[PDB]
């Protein structure tokens, strides 16, 4: 832990500076150091951890998809040698390393200490998300196990959020959006994908009347992402 | 138009 | 040299894959390995080296400017401690390291082997550019020396391009645009900045008639950047 | 509107 000698409060302050600077690798490393201090994370600190790693893995997924596409076009075609495959493997190995880093943080020991609905559902969502990114690139004998590790984390998160959070809760809506996409493009379950997004959209719509203007904006922002997916899929 | 997941890249 | 065991041709192929993937750190590392093979660089390979490092240093300069701005606002104000200064220093040290890497490549040994106008002017421009980025963050006793190392490289490039290239040559126009900005915002010479850009714009305009349609587009694209700067400065 | 230099970031 290269961050072990910095103050937790300085690690958090520098993650926010690094967001403002669009330095997401620094942001992630700062938030990694903060988590490794061993204290629970606040709501804001959880968002910083999520935002930081999502931008890092997002750059790697975009890069992976471009190289996977070139590599497929070269397997249809004039042989160019092993360079496309080797580079796509290097990026992929880096991507798997980032997903393993996040999963290790959730397993040591964020999830076992998360007693509140909002914290536990948040981390269980992250676990599903980072198993899903692994599954996007998996081809071997562990692909089925990876998919099931995503499904299992997503399901436990869904069970808690159903019992403990209103249908408009932004973490609950984000979980359902992502779980829906998992059904669609990972689990080959497009009907399940569509059913969960309609049901999520409809139940939140009925709860909107209970909300303040700011909560209303938060929730309706995510309902619009659910509706966009459904428009794309139907 | 790519399907949405949260959070989104910058 | 972590790239010493890869083929020069594979290093070049992977720099182009890394551009397509928007992986500019990989792109730069690949082009660094290619240069360290010790062979001269072709016109295309020079562009790959320039593009790769420009995107890397560009991310660091943007990050530096955001942190320098926050740091100044906090020195006007509620004390927040040393975190802003420490993080701006870390980014700055990384930026200086990238500029030193490029300058070491030009000095060992790209410039001494560049006998053609187009290659030598290209590298001398790069030398001026990367001394200019160092000068953007310099505050100590070497700032004056850094500025003069930029001016000196820019001038030698300008002398060769004046003797050896037509006024519409894209490397010559890019050199004059950048040298102009150096005068404006580094050397405190806004009149010199304006004079060089008008003179560059005017001499190329008179040479446009000698050009093919594609050369015409190349050159007029860069004359428009010269005109934009002049519109901003006058 | 920032003044231009070449090459430009992606
Ligand atoms: Mg430390
Ligand atoms: Mg059906
Ligand atoms: Mg090697
Ligand atoms: Mg005047």
Name its key features.
heterotetramer; A: 234 residues; mainly alpha; Delta-Endotoxin, domain 1; globular; B: 10 residues; little secondary structure; binds magnesium ion
Q: Could you describe the 3D structure shown?
A:
The complex is a heterotetramer, with two copies of chain A (234 residues) and two copies of chain B (10 residues). Chain A has 234 residues and is an all-alpha fold. Chain A has helices at 8-20, 24-35, 43-73, 83-113, 117-137, 143-164, 170-186, 190-207, 213-233. In chain A, helix 1 packs antiparallel against helix 2 (24-35) and helix 2 crosses helix 3 (43-73). By secondary structure, chain B is largely without helices or strands. Chain B is 0% helix and 0% strand. Chain B contains no helices and no strands. The N and C termini of chain B lie far apart (17 Å). Chains in contact: A-B, A-C, C-D. At the A-C interface, helix 1, helix 3 and helix 4 of A face helix 1, helix 3 and helix 4 of C. One magnesium ion is lined by residues 2-6 of chain A. One magnesium ion binds at residues 2-6 of chain A.
SSE map:
The complex is a heterotetramer, with 2 copies of chain A (234 residues) and 2 copies of chain B (10 residues).
Chain A: H1 8-20, H2 24-35, H3 43-73, H4 83-113, H5 117-137, H6 143-164, H7 170-186, H8 190-207, H9 213-233
Helix pairs in contact in A: 1-2, 2-3, 3-4, 3-5, 4-5, 5-6, 5-7, 6-7, 7-8, 7-9, 8-9
Chain B: no helix or strand
Residues 2-6 of chain A line the site of one magnesium ion.
GO molecular function (chains A, C): cadherin binding; identical protein binding; phosphoserine residue binding; protein kinase binding; protein kinase C inhibitor activity; protein sequestering activity
Main location (chains A, C): cytoplasm
Site (Interaction with phosphoserine on interacting protein) (chains A, C): 61, 132
């Amino acid at each position: 832990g290269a961050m072990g000698s910095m103050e937790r409060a300085s690690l958090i302050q520098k993650a926010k500076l690094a967001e403002q600077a669009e330095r997401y690798e620094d942001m992630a490393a700062f938030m990694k150091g903060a988590v490794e201090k061993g204290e629970e994370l606040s709501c804001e600190e959880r968002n910083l951890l999520s935002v930081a790693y999502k931008n890092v893995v997002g750059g790697q997924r975009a890069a992976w998809r471009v190289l996977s596409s070139i590599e497929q076009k070269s397997n249809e075609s004039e042989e160019k040698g092993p360079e496309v495959r080797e580079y796509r493997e290097k990026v992929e190995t880096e991507l798997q390393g980032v997903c393993d880093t996040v999963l290790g943080l959730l397993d040591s020991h964020l999830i076992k200490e998360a007693g509140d609905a909002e914290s536990r559902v948040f981390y269980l969502k992250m676990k599903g998300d980072y198993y899903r990114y692994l599954a996007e690139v998996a081809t071997g004998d562990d692909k089925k196990r990876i998919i099931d590790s995503a499904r299992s984390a997503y399901q436990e998160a869904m069970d808690i959020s159903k019992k403990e959070m209103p249908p408009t809760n932004p973490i609950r809506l984000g979980l359902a959006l992502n779980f829906s996409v998992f059904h669609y493009e990972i689990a080959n379950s497009p009907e399940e994908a569509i059913s969960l997004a309609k049901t999520t959209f409809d139940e939140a719509m009925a709860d909107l009347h209970t909300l303040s203007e700011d909560s209303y904006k938060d929730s309706t922002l995510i309902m619009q992402l659910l509706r966009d997916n459904l428009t794309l899929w139907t | 138009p790519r399907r949405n997941t949260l959070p989104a890249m910058d």
